[PDB]
Amino acid sequence: DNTIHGRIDQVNQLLELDHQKRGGARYTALDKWTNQLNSLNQAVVSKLA
Amino acid sequence: NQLTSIHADLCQLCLLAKCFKPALPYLDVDMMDICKENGAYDAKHFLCYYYYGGMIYTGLKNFERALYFYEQAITTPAMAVSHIMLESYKKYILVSLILLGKVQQLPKYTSQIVGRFIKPLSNAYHELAQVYSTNNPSELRNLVNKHSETFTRDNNMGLVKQCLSSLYKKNIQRLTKTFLTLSLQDMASRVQLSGPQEAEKYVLHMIEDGEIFASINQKDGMVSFHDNPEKYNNPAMLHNIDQEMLKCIELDERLKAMDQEITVNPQF
Amino acid sequence: FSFKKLLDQCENQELEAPGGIATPPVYGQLLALYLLHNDMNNARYLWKRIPPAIKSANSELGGIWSVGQRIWQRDFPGIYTTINAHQWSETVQPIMEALRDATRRRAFALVSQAYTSIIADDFAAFVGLPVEEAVKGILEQGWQADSTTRMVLPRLARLTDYVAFLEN
Amino acid sequence: SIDEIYKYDKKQQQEILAAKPWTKDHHYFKYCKISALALLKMVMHARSGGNLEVMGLMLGKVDGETMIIMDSFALPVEGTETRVNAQAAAYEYMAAYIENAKQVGRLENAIGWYHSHPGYGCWLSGIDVSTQMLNQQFQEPFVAVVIDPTRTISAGKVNLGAFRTYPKGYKPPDEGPSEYQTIPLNKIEDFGVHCKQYYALEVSYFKSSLDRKLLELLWNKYWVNTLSSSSLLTNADYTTGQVFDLSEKLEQSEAQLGRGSFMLGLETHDRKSEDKLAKATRDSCKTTIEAIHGLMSQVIKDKLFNQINIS
Amino acid sequence: LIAQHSAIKMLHSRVKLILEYVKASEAGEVPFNHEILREAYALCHCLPVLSTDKFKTDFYDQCNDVGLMAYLGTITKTCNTMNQFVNKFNVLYDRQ
Amino acid sequence: LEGLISARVDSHSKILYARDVDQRSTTFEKSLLMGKEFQRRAKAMMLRAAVLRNQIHVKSP
Amino acid sequence: SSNLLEQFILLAKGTSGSALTALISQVLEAPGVYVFGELLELANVQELAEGANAAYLQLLNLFAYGTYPDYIANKESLPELSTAQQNKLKHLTIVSLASRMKCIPYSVLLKDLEMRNLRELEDLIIEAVYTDIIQGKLDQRNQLLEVDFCIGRDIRKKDINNIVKTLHEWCDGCEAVLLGIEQQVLRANQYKENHNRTQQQVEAEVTN
């Protein structure tokens, strides 16, 4: 339901709660940017003859 | 370095009398524009230089340059069939079966001839690629004896053998993705190596190659996978990205001189 | 260092000097030089270029190719026995000296990455010296040996060019 | 000259106002000279807003293709990035100020308005262009000015552009590029359409004896803090935002070039979405230049201080 | 870069007045002192401003991001001239 | 492999662990790889443009 | 301190001998003192040296040029210290270690100060930081002290050459940095100049 944030370690009886966040927002925007450049190069070079 | 027909013939001499080493600085350089003014050149020379240059690089086990060399022998414009075009295609399927898990893409500026004529011409190879996608070596093995006479007459024997070892490498490497720790006995049954001793032998070959990051536990009779060459915060990675930028800035500069050249020419 | 130059002068020499089949010592050094780089494909291809005439004429050459058949299998203990099998004075020895030390390093290096744990008897084959000599060495380097079971555990200038480029 | 510039001439304005050349061409002007006073007052007032927008007025004159900005004064008015013609509320305060100003001996007519865009660059928005376009009819002469008071502290360079916009249904020329100071995620679009509608004018100055120097000497001590801008964290939000939007543009480009603009014996003419890659490359430059500029603030520290160690 | 330049030039001038003072108190012309020398001594010692293991990776992490950012921009620029080259070529040497 | 569950089995003692994905490792590797193939296609294009401009294609005569 | 120093010099200069002997024991006890330059340089203290009160300057010396390990070493020859005098020297050892390394690990601090544990040690650095004579923070993760700031006491007039060398290294590299930036700005400019040149040059010929 996501009213508790994290996951469980049942072989030690712990909650590995999540506060393991950092940024992420920069890193995912660079991935979206990075995937369009592959499709764009493929598209442009393929127009030649 | 401008590319012309003496380049093809250099590779031919090396191919017959093995001593691939002198030819390599010519090959390892990529270029734009052929040597012209007064003839002395045609599309067959272009195709044969790249066919052979692929042949040599696969041999060195430089699968990266081979793939690229092989591709240039397919992308060439043609409206007629030739013996080099069949061979170039067939060698391409075998190489892409090593590098990739199925055949690697071809652009849409490929010649018409490679689709229309060459594909029913290369049926056997399409069946190699199909069996490889099932991911079962026993079947791939049986197919190679069925298809054998073709392999010999076309003389891309021995390469066809590599595609079989590369499936076993793929089959080991997919397990890495899935498992942290797996047994050698377990690896051996599933991969169909059929001997844990060989499981240990196969990863150890790959450790030296650097296709795998792993460690062997012979107390437990396990393999432990690592997988951590880069954390991406190394200055080593910064320098590598910085080196890659210098390449791009020069590549763009070639394009500027060539775009400008068309700007001087009057448009149609 | 010295060896790299020695391949360069020899590589030149193969094409330039003969009528197409060069003399037996030149081929031997060259073959031996390819094994030090561990460029085994070109080595193998070297032997396949070699006619039956040189194989009868020269047996030393055929020993150098035998180490190399094993390097292809990558079976260590086998490598060592072949190093001892043949010697040819002057013409093979300085490069041979290097071959023996290049495979031992390759072997220690290989093991250090390859195994988080290894049997001491298998390790003895890799370095190629017996159990007493090996267990004595590992301790100094700082690798752990377990005894009883006998197992061994290995252990601005760029930026301005780029800004200048994007602004233009 | 140096003293000829300081005196104001009522007659030169009376001739100019009758003549009215601007009706012919609104791209007419080309240079600016702004007083040392005008500039310092404009930065301080802008800075007093904080990261919140403020407007002020400028008194000046024109002489040929030069605009001259003699003095400036602040207004306590709210409506910079919302209210179209916010200045109206200000009118009563302006009428006071000009009357007070004439009697001490400053007779120079209003040349234009200044406002500021804090933390998003020097450019005119949808509110700003719409308010300028009324002013170029009614108010003349009237010029827009923009300054950023936070960005400026890092770079050390005064970003001040005095601009004027073109009236409706006027075809722009090929006058594209200008200074690259990044915009936020939703403001990117707004710049994109409006930029060709206006141009910036080049600026000159002059100097003498009470304000400049407290600052000049203070910088001699002060210099350390500008090199600890350290932008990459301060405005971290900018990179993620522009880069996710730049991705949406590349999707637009894949389709635009891919299918092609539908045309039947008609060829594209000036548009702000004409030749998508050619536009797009520049958007990559405004985001890249700021990023490496961030790296250069870091690089200086690392070489200057950290390499000294203890010998 | 102008601010950055001038900033170095201020540090050149700051080093210079402290340095000539310390020498002057040894040499003669200024007398010996404790209060000012103890402080100048202390000023030298602080350098370099961090060396910890903790700083190094976070410093590189930001440098590495701005290294990718720059790489993805130089490709976009190159793509543009490639699309322009390919457009002009097809019209002239082919029929497009 | 086929699905999205980023997890690894420790089949030694039978515990299902515990793969943390890293948004950084996947973007950086991709950007570098993507950069190699972009350059290679550009080189491939120069070679395509080179035979077209000086007008050779494969012919049976 | 500030105020207390201005009183003590005058008082030292005022009297001789038997009172001066007394004054040394008082300066070291008196709080807020983490300097011991000025009193040593006066002529008045100097008379007691080479006699039966020489040991008081010899200790004062040991505080001034030296530290807690230099003290213990000749604990027999020099007269006693009280808790305030010892605690002041112990803080004054940290400044010295800080002169060599910016970050100093616990095992170094621990040895030199001869302290019973980490927590007693960590209490002394917090007390210093409140008086603000040293500024710095504890890292219990890497087991270091990472100092923000520290101030002398340290006359050390033989060793002073080191300070001049570092000041000098700080100098020479500056110019090496300026010729640096000057180069880049001209290189940026050189690129834009050529780029403008080539485009304008190419465009003209289209007209023919």
Side-chain angles (χ1 to χ4, degrees), chain G residues 55-74:
Chain G
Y56 296 89
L57 293 77
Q58 188 65 302
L59 184 58
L60 205 51
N61 211 87
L62 234 55
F63 266 71
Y65 297 86
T67 59
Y68 218 96
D70 302 311
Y71 175 69
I72 52 163
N74 298 290

Side-chain angles (χ1 to χ4, degrees), chain B residues 104-120:
Chain B
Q104 164 78 5
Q105 54 163 99
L106 300 298
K108 318 208 181 96
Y109 44 85
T110 198
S111 185
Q112 311 297 303
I113 309 309
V114 187
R116 278 173 192 156
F117 290 96
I118 299 187
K119 187 202 84 178

Side-chain angles (χ1 to χ4, degrees), chain D:
Chain D
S1 296
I2 298 310
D3 300 289
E4 159 79 47
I5 189 65
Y6 304 163
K7 52 181 175 174
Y8 159 74
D9 193 3
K10 205 168 287 190
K11 306 185 63 177
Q12 186 185 103
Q13 299 285 262
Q14 294 297 105
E15 282 179 355
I16 289 163
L17 291 160
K20 61 165 68 195
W22 48 72
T23 199
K24 294 305 193 291
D25 197 50
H26 289 79
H27 189 174
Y28 187 55
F29 311 82
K30 285 290 178 292
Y31 290 116
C32 205
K33 56 185 60 177
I34 304 174
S35 195
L37 181 48
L39 180 64
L40 265 75
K41 272 175 170 181
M42 279 190 273
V43 297
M44 283 291 265
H45 184 231
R47 170 177 149 172
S48 287
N51 309 310
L52 289 304
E53 301 80 73
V54 277
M55 305 159 63
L57 217 274
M58 299 180 293
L59 300 168
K61 66 166 173 309
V62 272
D63 179 61
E65 300 179 301
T66 309
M67 294 196 120
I68 301 70
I69 310 300
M70 299 288 296
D71 173 56
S72 290
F73 60 99
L75 299 160
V77 57
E78 180 174 55
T80 316
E81 214 72 4
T82 311
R83 312 182 189 196
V84 192
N85 202 340
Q87 304 166 184
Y91 278 179
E92 307 309 270
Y93 184 93
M94 295 178 195
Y97 192 98
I98 198 59
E99 209 176 33
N100 282 14
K102 273 197 172 56
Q103 61 170 281
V104 295
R106 301 195 80 74
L107 309 305
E108 47 260 317
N109 304 338
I111 200 161
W113 68 306
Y114 78 76
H115 62 289
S116 58
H117 271 181
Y120 53 97
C122 173
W123 50 280
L124 279 70
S125 83
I127 306 86
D128 303 312
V129 294
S130 62
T131 300
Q132 172 71 12
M133 280 188 268
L134 299 154
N135 295 338
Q136 294 180 132
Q137 284 178 120
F138 305 138
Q139 302 293 5
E140 294 292 79
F142 231 69
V143 56
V145 176
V146 183
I147 303 177
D148 198 319
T150 182
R151 212 135 274 161
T152 201
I153 317 301
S154 304
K157 172 67 169 183
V158 175
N159 55 101
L160 188 152
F163 295 86
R164 287 167 67 127
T165 316
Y166 305 144
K168 61 147 273 70
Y170 206 91
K171 293 62 53 190
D174 299 324
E175 197 277 298
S178 46
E179 325 185 37
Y180 206 120
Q181 298 175 105
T182 205
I183 38 264
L185 200 172
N186 297 106
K187 299 203 90 53
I188 186 53
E189 197 175 83
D190 216 67
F191 177 68
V193 293
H194 294 321
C195 60
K196 265 48 169 35
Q197 298 174 3
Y198 51 79
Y199 64 92
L201 290 81
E202 206 185 299
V203 179
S204 30
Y205 287 112
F206 9 75
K207 60 221 195 170
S208 298
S209 314
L210 224 64
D211 265 39
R212 275 176 53 253
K213 228 172 75 78
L214 273 183
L215 327 158
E216 284 173 277
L217 210 125
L218 187 261
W219 168 241
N220 310 350
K221 304 300 180 301
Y222 207 79
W223 59 281
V224 70
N225 299 280
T226 66
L227 315 188
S228 56
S229 302
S230 320
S231 318
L232 287 88
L233 323 164
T234 72
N235 49 46
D237 306 294
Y238 116 55
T239 68
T240 168
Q242 282 283 294
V243 177
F244 192 98
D245 208 287
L246 189 44
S247 312
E248 292 182 304
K249 303 183 219 304
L250 306 170
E251 288 175 289
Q252 294 179 89
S253 294
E254 173 59 61
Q256 194 76 91
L257 282 46
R259 278 89 203 63
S261 52
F262 197 69
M263 289 287 163
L264 280 183
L266 196 63
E267 47 173 44
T268 191
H269 174 272
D270 200 278
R271 208 194 192 187
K272 297 100 169 57
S273 42
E274 166 185 68
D275 213 345
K276 300 286 288 203
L277 290 185
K279 299 285 154 176
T281 180
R282 319 283 77 146
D283 298 294
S284 281
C285 299
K286 170 181 209 295
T287 65
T288 298
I289 261 48
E290 299 290 291
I292 52 215
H293 287 190
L295 202 49
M296 284 176 183
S297 305
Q298 313 278 321
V299 169
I300 198 173
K301 309 162 190 164
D302 208 38
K303 306 288 59 164
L304 278 177
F305 299 113
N306 286 56
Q307 296 313 257
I308 312 167
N309 318 263
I310 173 154
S311 199

Side-chain angles (χ1 to χ4, degrees), chain G residues 34 87-95 124-125 127-128 134:
Chain G
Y34 300 99
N87 285 330
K88 241 85 172 149
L89 200 58
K90 292 164 184 288
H91 299 166
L92 294 164
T93 299
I94 306 297
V95 302
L124 254 71
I125 182 75
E127 285 277 67
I134 317 176

